[PDB]
């Protein structure tokens, strides 16, 4: 069916033209068991105050646009009380729910690829050098891809067909993905569990997964139609818990 509703915390999300819900690699986000845990102290578990939908900034799908990416959970640094527990606790563990919505018309056309890339290590633009943190993820805005080659000395290689990683951009469909076809679809929701090699990790020096939105089939329309087609991203943490409470840093 095409109508869904996802209620988390004090916030709901209603859609009327939905494809389905892709759920990670099969499993649902849950809490850390006693069989796998290694932190000795008691973990905190804020149910409603942390696990709720946060709406990020809006971008503009232009006719010459090529792609964007957000790195998580760094994109929700100043989003409510989820970002306040990250500063006070040394450890964190959470799953997510990534709702991406872009409605245009019956007369517009286009396509998007919404992947969630775990451990998306990204390559620099000047080889024999290294990126900096200010070039990987902005504070709330989207870092975009470039159609041509990136010339910078400390930026990500933001070419689009190599996906910023050195791999084929068509082969990104292994990861949990949907497609926003403006002919059939309106929104794309992806539920990602906690994917890491360690049971918990500090969510300041480790981007857990990267959300990429890439238009494979570009946007065209007619001059009678609208000329502003925005994309909005709404991400909710799910089953979040923390350890290691100390002073806030930073700040």
């Amino acid at each position: 069916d095409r109508v869904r509703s996802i209620t988390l915390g004090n916030s709901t999300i209603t859609t009327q033209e939905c494809a389905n819900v892709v759920v990670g690699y099969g499993v649902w986000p849950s809490y850390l068991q006693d069989n796998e845990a290694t932190a000795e102290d008691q973990p905190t578990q804020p149910d409603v105050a942390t696990c709720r939908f946060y709406t990020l900034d809006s971008i503009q799908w232009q006719k010459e646009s090529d792609g964007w990416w957000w790195k998580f959970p760094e994109a929700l640094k100043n989003m409510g009380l989820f970002g306040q527990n990250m500063e006070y606790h040394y450890l964190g563990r959470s799953g997510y729910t990534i709702h991406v919505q872009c409605n245009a018309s019956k007369f517009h056309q286009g396509c998007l690829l919404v992947v969630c890339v775990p451990e998306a290590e990204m390559g620099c633009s000047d080889v024999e050098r290294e990126v900096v943190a200010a070039s990987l993820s902005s504070e709330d805005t989207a870092k975009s891809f470039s159609r041509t080659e990136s010339n910078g000395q400390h930026t990500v290689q933001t070419v689009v067909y190599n996906a910023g990683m050195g791999v084929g951009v068509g082969n990104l469909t292994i990861f949990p993905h949907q497609w926003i076809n403006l002919r059939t679809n309106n929104s794309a929701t992806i539920v990602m569990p906690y994917i890491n090699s360690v049971p918990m990790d500090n969510m300041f020096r480790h981007y857990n997964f990267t959300l990429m939105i890439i238009p494979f089939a570009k946007l065209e329309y007619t001059e009678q139609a609208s000329n502003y087609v925005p994309i909005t991203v709404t991400v909710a943490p799910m089953c979040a818990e923390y350890n290691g409470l100390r002073l806030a840093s930073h700040q």
């Binding site: 775990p118 990204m122 080889v127 190599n162 791999v167 300041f204 480790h206 981007y207």
Partner: protein, 274 residues
């Protein structure tokens, strides 16, 4: 049997409302359409299997990971032994096979292939006994030997193997020796909590070093030797498969690249020839 492939059940003509070919990729779903939905097929008993395509049969083949040379000369004591910070990034044929998966957990056999020669110049040997090599593994933080004939070559706790030339290659087994629960091939993050330092997997690689030397002075001439290390991962579990790499590697500590074309060119979009 195990683990065979599915058979094609026989099919006749049809006129149905249940069309299986028409689907929707927008849900992020790969279709389960077998050939019996779009054409008439016959009952064949497919006896093929996928034993050669499992994870354990794909990775349990030894590959070279380093090539190290060392002398037996006098002077320049850095050439009298070789060093290796343990990596799986220096030789590309095993680096690309590992980097189809994000995480990996396995045991390993490590085979050392040492092959020597006689160095040229005046005052050659003309009668030499066999050579013997000591291949010491230093876990992270141990005493590093500054040269050959050092106190750190005693190795009361470091595992060392002694090997005379002419016999079978040396081989031992190593368990899953990581700190975490999987060898992270990719690490999207930093080393310091202030988002500064070393971006990438090079901060997670803390496995130790490998040192190899001649335990014999000789006293007449020089003989170089070439240690080649071979890695065979066994008892392998793997998680989160990645796309295979497209651009060629540049560095042994980075995923840095230069942007390459997606495929090789062809003449036309409809180029069924020739």
């Amino acid at each position: 049997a195990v683990a065979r492939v599915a058979d094609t059940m026989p099919t006749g003509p049809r006129n149905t409302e249940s069309v299986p070919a028409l689907t929707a990729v927008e849900t992020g779903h790969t279709s389960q359409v077998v050939p019996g939905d779009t054409m008439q097929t016959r009952h064949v008993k497919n006896y093929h299997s996928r034993t050669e395509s499992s994870i354990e049969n794909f990775l349990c083949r030894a590959a070279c990971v380093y090539i190290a040379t060392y002398k037996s000369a006098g002077g320049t004591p850095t050439e009298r032994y070789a060093s290796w910070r343990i990596n799986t990034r220096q030789m590309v044929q095993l680096r690309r096979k590992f980097e189809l998966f994000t995480y990996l957990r396995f045991d390993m056999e490590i085979t050392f292939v040492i092959t020597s020669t006689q160095d040229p110049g005046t005052q050659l040997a003309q009668d030499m006994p066999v050579l013997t090599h000591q291949i010491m593994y230093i876990p992270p933080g141990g005493p590093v030997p500054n040269s050959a004939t050092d106190f750190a070559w005693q190795s009361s706790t470091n595992p060392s193997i002694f090997w005379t030339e002419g016999c079978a290659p040396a081989r031992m087994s190593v368990p899953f020796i990581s700190i975490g629960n999987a060898y992270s091939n990719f690490y999207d993050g930093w080393s310091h909590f202030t988002q500064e330092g070393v971006y990438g997997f090079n901060s997670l690689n803390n496995m130790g070093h490998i040192y190899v030397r001649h335990v014999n002075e000789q006293s007449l001439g020089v003989s170089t030797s070439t240690l080649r290390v071979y890695f065979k991962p066994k008892h392998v579990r793997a998680w989160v498969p990645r796309p295979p790499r497209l651009s060629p590697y540049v560095k042994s500590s980075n995923v840095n690249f230069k942007p390459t074309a997606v495929t090789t060119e062809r003449k036309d979009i409809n180029d069924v020839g020739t």
